[PDB]
Amino acid sequence: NARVPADLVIVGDKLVFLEALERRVYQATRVAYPLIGNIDI
Amino acid sequence: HLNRVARAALLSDLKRRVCADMFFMTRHAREPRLISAYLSDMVSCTQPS
Amino acid sequence: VDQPVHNYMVKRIHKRSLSAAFAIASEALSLLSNTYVDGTEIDSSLRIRAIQQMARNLRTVLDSFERGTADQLLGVLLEKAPPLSLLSPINKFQPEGH
Amino acid sequence: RFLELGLSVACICTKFPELAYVRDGVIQFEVQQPMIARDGPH
């Protein structure tokens, strides 16, 4: 295994990664960062 | 690679940034959990070099 | 009187792929092929520059696949997930089924 | 003073006092940008 810097938040009873990959990946470029979808009302 | 929906509304969404929040200090002598909502989100923000 | 049940499920794989492009200009290609070398220093510098450009490109065309697998996973996971606002009441307010 | 206060570290030590026997600076630096493609037929 290898040590890696990342943030881990405990919610409820489960330790989950809290990844917001917009900086390392999808950056300064031409790819659609998902999670910005649209809704129709 | 956007079309005429983002900047033809550059004056219809941004000029939001033409109607709410503002120049700090001293009429409402009375509020700490948003004065740092453009103070605690304008100082440190994005991409590296 | 109830009798126990067994369930069998079968799922099939789905195929995708990833690609990236990588070009070298005719100038650089001719320098690299060592066809028109004059055996002088002035072309050694140009050939080294062409090699460095090949490097500075092949680098990231290959780094690209690693940085793209993440995009693929996000795509499939977004396509996969039903909304919380509908999944939550289904599994809480309803115990078993039918 | 101009050591122990602050009124300077955001600059860079590089060199010309007598300046302008130096004509001439149009000085710059690139950015490379790498391979994006998405996932999907785009």
Side-chain angles (χ1 to χ4, degrees), chain D residues 4-24:
Chain D
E4 292 176 351
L5 296 175
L7 205 67
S8 87
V9 69
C11 283
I12 194 63
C13 293
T14 178
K15 317 205 185 75
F16 278 140
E18 52 270 14
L19 172 62
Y21 290 142
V22 165
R23 292 177 64 190
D24 175 346

mmCIF file of all heavy atoms in Angstrom, chain D residues 4-24:
data_model
loop_
_atom_site.group_PDB
_atom_site.id
_atom_site.type_symbol
_atom_site.label_atom_id
_atom_site.label_comp_id
_atom_site.label_asym_id
_atom_site.label_seq_id
_atom_site.Cartn_x
_atom_site.Cartn_y
_atom_site.Cartn_z
ATOM 1 N N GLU D 4 12.357 44.131 7.434
ATOM 2 C CA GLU D 4 11.662 43.384 8.500
ATOM 3 C C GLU D 4 10.162 43.664 8.606
ATOM 4 O O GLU D 4 9.445 42.954 9.320
ATOM 5 C CB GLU D 4 12.319 43.726 9.832
ATOM 6 C CG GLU D 4 13.725 43.239 10.062
ATOM 7 C CD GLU D 4 14.334 43.715 11.375
ATOM 8 O OE1 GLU D 4 13.730 44.569 12.058
ATOM 9 O OE2 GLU D 4 15.415 43.211 11.738
ATOM 10 N N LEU D 5 9.682 44.660 7.889
ATOM 11 C CA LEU D 5 8.311 45.128 7.848
ATOM 12 C C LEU D 5 7.563 44.099 7.096
ATOM 13 O O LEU D 5 7.959 42.939 6.966
ATOM 14 C CB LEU D 5 8.112 46.379 6.930
ATOM 15 C CG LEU D 5 8.321 47.889 6.479
ATOM 16 C CD1 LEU D 5 7.679 48.207 5.141
ATOM 17 C CD2 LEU D 5 8.472 49.157 7.308
ATOM 18 N N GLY D 6 6.512 44.589 6.505
ATOM 19 C CA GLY D 6 6.385 44.242 5.145
ATOM 20 C C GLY D 6 6.197 45.388 4.199
ATOM 21 O O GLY D 6 5.337 46.242 4.429
ATOM 22 N N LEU D 7 6.944 45.417 3.123
ATOM 23 C CA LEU D 7 6.345 46.028 1.968
ATOM 24 C C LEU D 7 6.839 45.321 0.706
ATOM 25 O O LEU D 7 6.591 45.808 -0.399
ATOM 26 C CB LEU D 7 6.581 47.540 2.120
ATOM 27 C CG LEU D 7 5.953 48.855 1.655
ATOM 28 C CD1 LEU D 7 4.600 49.033 2.284
ATOM 29 C CD2 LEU D 7 6.790 49.977 2.195
ATOM 30 N N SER D 8 7.521 44.162 0.873
ATOM 31 C CA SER D 8 7.967 43.357 -0.266
ATOM 32 C C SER D 8 8.432 41.904 0.051
ATOM 33 O O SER D 8 9.441 41.758 0.738
ATOM 34 C CB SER D 8 9.107 44.093 -0.933
ATOM 35 O OG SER D 8 10.319 43.729 -0.295
ATOM 36 N N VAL D 9 7.758 40.836 -0.461
ATOM 37 C CA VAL D 9 8.429 39.643 -1.058
ATOM 38 C C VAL D 9 7.855 39.220 -2.423
ATOM 39 O O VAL D 9 8.570 38.611 -3.215
ATOM 40 C CB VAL D 9 8.420 38.253 -0.364
ATOM 41 C CG1 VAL D 9 7.133 37.583 -0.331
ATOM 42 C CG2 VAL D 9 9.518 37.313 -0.862
ATOM 43 N N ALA D 10 6.613 39.569 -2.774
ATOM 44 C CA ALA D 10 6.093 39.216 -4.098
ATOM 45 C C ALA D 10 6.761 39.967 -5.238
ATOM 46 O O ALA D 10 6.171 40.899 -5.739
ATOM 47 C CB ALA D 10 4.591 39.498 -4.221
ATOM 48 N N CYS D 11 8.001 39.658 -5.588
ATOM 49 C CA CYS D 11 8.669 40.097 -6.810
ATOM 50 C C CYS D 11 9.749 39.059 -7.038
ATOM 51 O O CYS D 11 9.765 38.023 -6.377
ATOM 52 C CB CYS D 11 9.264 41.545 -6.777
ATOM 53 S SG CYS D 11 8.308 43.260 -6.950
ATOM 54 N N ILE D 12 10.654 39.306 -7.964
ATOM 55 C CA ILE D 12 11.755 38.374 -8.138
ATOM 56 C C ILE D 12 13.054 39.149 -8.282
ATOM 57 O O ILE D 12 13.104 40.216 -8.909
ATOM 58 C CB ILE D 12 11.531 37.390 -9.295
ATOM 59 C CG1 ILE D 12 12.541 36.257 -9.176
ATOM 60 C CG2 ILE D 12 11.771 38.003 -10.630
ATOM 61 C CD1 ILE D 12 12.386 35.460 -7.929
ATOM 62 N N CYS D 13 14.079 38.633 -7.601
ATOM 63 C CA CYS D 13 15.461 39.038 -7.763
ATOM 64 C C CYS D 13 16.000 38.507 -9.103
ATOM 65 O O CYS D 13 16.367 37.336 -9.222
ATOM 66 C CB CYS D 13 16.397 38.573 -6.598
ATOM 67 S SG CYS D 13 16.749 38.869 -4.631
ATOM 68 N N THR D 14 16.021 39.384 -10.116
ATOM 69 C CA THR D 14 16.793 39.243 -11.354
ATOM 70 C C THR D 14 17.258 40.656 -11.726
ATOM 71 O O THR D 14 16.981 41.579 -10.969
ATOM 72 C CB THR D 14 15.991 38.522 -12.436
ATOM 73 O OG1 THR D 14 16.774 38.474 -13.611
ATOM 74 C CG2 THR D 14 14.655 39.159 -12.712
ATOM 75 N N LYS D 15 18.069 40.836 -12.792
ATOM 76 C CA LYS D 15 19.110 41.879 -12.694
ATOM 77 C C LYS D 15 19.378 42.869 -13.852
ATOM 78 O O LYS D 15 19.656 42.434 -14.970
ATOM 79 C CB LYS D 15 20.407 41.167 -12.309
ATOM 80 C CG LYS D 15 20.227 40.068 -11.201
ATOM 81 C CD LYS D 15 21.447 39.749 -10.361
ATOM 82 C CE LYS D 15 21.203 38.591 -9.392
ATOM 83 N NZ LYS D 15 21.159 37.200 -9.932
ATOM 84 N N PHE D 16 19.255 44.214 -13.549
ATOM 85 C CA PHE D 16 19.705 45.363 -14.391
ATOM 86 C C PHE D 16 19.627 46.777 -13.765
ATOM 87 O O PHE D 16 18.565 47.407 -13.812
ATOM 88 C CB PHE D 16 18.920 45.402 -15.698
ATOM 89 C CG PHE D 16 19.435 44.497 -16.724
ATOM 90 C CD1 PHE D 16 18.570 43.807 -17.515
ATOM 91 C CD2 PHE D 16 20.769 44.161 -16.748
ATOM 92 C CE1 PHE D 16 19.043 42.919 -18.383
ATOM 93 C CE2 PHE D 16 21.255 43.279 -17.648
ATOM 94 C CZ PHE D 16 20.402 42.667 -18.472
ATOM 95 N N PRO D 17 20.723 47.317 -13.159
ATOM 96 C CA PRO D 17 20.545 48.579 -12.411
ATOM 97 C C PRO D 17 20.557 49.753 -13.321
ATOM 98 O O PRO D 17 19.568 50.053 -13.966
ATOM 99 C CB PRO D 17 21.813 48.673 -11.560
ATOM 100 C CG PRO D 17 22.890 47.945 -12.451
ATOM 101 C CD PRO D 17 22.097 47.357 -13.679
ATOM 102 N N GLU D 18 21.752 50.210 -13.642
ATOM 103 C CA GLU D 18 21.867 50.623 -15.001
ATOM 104 C C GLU D 18 21.125 49.644 -15.888
ATOM 105 O O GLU D 18 21.417 48.477 -16.086
ATOM 106 C CB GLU D 18 23.336 50.817 -15.341
ATOM 107 C CG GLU D 18 24.314 49.790 -15.078
ATOM 108 C CD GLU D 18 24.922 49.935 -13.694
ATOM 109 O OE1 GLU D 18 24.359 50.688 -12.870
ATOM 110 O OE2 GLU D 18 25.965 49.300 -13.429
ATOM 111 N N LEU D 19 20.004 50.197 -16.309
ATOM 112 C CA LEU D 19 18.960 49.474 -16.989
ATOM 113 C C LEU D 19 19.209 49.304 -18.445
ATOM 114 O O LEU D 19 19.391 48.185 -18.894
ATOM 115 C CB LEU D 19 17.628 50.193 -16.845
ATOM 116 C CG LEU D 19 16.625 49.492 -17.756
ATOM 117 C CD1 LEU D 19 16.350 48.067 -17.450
ATOM 118 C CD2 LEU D 19 15.387 50.301 -17.853
ATOM 119 N N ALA D 20 19.262 50.394 -19.175
ATOM 120 C CA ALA D 20 18.749 50.340 -20.514
ATOM 121 C C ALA D 20 19.831 50.405 -21.579
ATOM 122 O O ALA D 20 19.536 50.760 -22.716
ATOM 123 C CB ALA D 20 17.694 51.432 -20.650
ATOM 124 N N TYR D 21 21.072 50.042 -21.284
ATOM 125 C CA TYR D 21 21.863 49.577 -22.401
ATOM 126 C C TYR D 21 21.134 48.376 -22.960
ATOM 127 O O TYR D 21 21.168 48.115 -24.165
ATOM 128 C CB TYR D 21 23.303 49.233 -21.979
ATOM 129 C CG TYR D 21 24.206 50.406 -21.595
ATOM 130 C CD1 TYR D 21 25.109 50.283 -20.545
ATOM 131 C CD2 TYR D 21 24.189 51.607 -22.298
ATOM 132 C CE1 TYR D 21 25.939 51.325 -20.175
ATOM 133 C CE2 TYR D 21 25.032 52.660 -21.939
ATOM 134 C CZ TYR D 21 25.900 52.510 -20.872
ATOM 135 O OH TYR D 21 26.737 53.538 -20.498
ATOM 136 N N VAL D 22 20.400 47.721 -22.066
ATOM 137 C CA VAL D 22 19.141 47.050 -22.343
ATOM 138 C C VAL D 22 18.242 47.990 -23.124
ATOM 139 O O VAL D 22 17.551 48.829 -22.549
ATOM 140 C CB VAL D 22 18.459 46.679 -21.027
ATOM 141 C CG1 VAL D 22 16.978 46.307 -21.195
ATOM 142 C CG2 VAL D 22 19.315 45.687 -20.257
ATOM 143 N N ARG D 23 18.087 47.707 -24.400
ATOM 144 C CA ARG D 23 16.885 48.125 -25.084
ATOM 145 C C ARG D 23 15.653 47.427 -24.519
ATOM 146 O O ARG D 23 14.716 48.078 -24.059
ATOM 147 C CB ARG D 23 17.057 47.850 -26.569
ATOM 148 C CG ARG D 23 18.022 48.622 -27.347
ATOM 149 C CD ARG D 23 17.936 48.011 -28.714
ATOM 150 N NE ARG D 23 16.630 48.204 -29.306
ATOM 151 C CZ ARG D 23 16.201 47.623 -30.420
ATOM 152 N NH1 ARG D 23 17.026 46.985 -31.229
ATOM 153 N NH2 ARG D 23 14.903 47.686 -30.730
ATOM 154 N N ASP D 24 15.693 46.110 -24.417
ATOM 155 C CA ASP D 24 14.708 45.357 -25.172
ATOM 156 C C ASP D 24 14.151 44.072 -24.574
ATOM 157 O O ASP D 24 14.766 43.013 -24.668
ATOM 158 C CB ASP D 24 15.405 45.279 -26.536
ATOM 159 C CG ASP D 24 14.749 44.485 -27.560
ATOM 160 O OD1 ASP D 24 13.878 43.757 -27.222
ATOM 161 O OD2 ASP D 24 15.076 44.650 -28.752
#
